[PDB]
């Protein structure tokens, strides 16, 4: 699944992960640490919303 950061143009795609910050491809959003934030703008998980 894919989730948009409400606050910038970033999209978290579970099939991409966030590898530059230590999150492997295939990591589900539910499994991101509670201290994970958007790699571009620092918004928390509460500021992401599922998109198609
Ligand atoms: Fe962002």
Swiss-Prot record:
Gene Ontology BP term (one): alkane catabolic process
Domain Rubredoxin-like: 1-51
SUPFAM superfamilies assigned to the protein according to its UniProt record, in alphabetical order: Rubredoxin-like
Pfam families assigned: Rubredoxin (PF00301)
Listed GO MF terms: electron transfer activity; iron ion binding
Entries under InterPro entries matching the protein: Rubredoxin (IPR024922), Rubredoxin-like_dom (IPR024934), Rubredoxin_dom (IPR024935), Rubredoxin_ET (IPR050526), Rubredoxin_Fe_BS (IPR018527)
Bilayer-crossing regions: none
Cofactor(s) needed for function: Fe(3+)
Alphabetical list of CDD domains matching this protein: rubredoxin
Entry's cofactor comment: Binds 1 Fe(3+) ion per subunit.
Domain of life per record: Archaea
Residues given in the record as Fe cation binding sites: 5, 8, 38, 41
Keywords: Electron transport, Iron, Metal-binding, Transport
Keyword Metal-binding belongs to the record: yes
Assigned protein family: Belongs to the rubredoxin family.
Function: Rubredoxin is a small nonheme, iron protein lacking acid-labile sulfide. Its single Fe, chelated to 4 Cys, functions as an electron acceptor and may also stabilize the conformation of the molecule.
Name of protein: Rubredoxin
Gene coding for it: rub
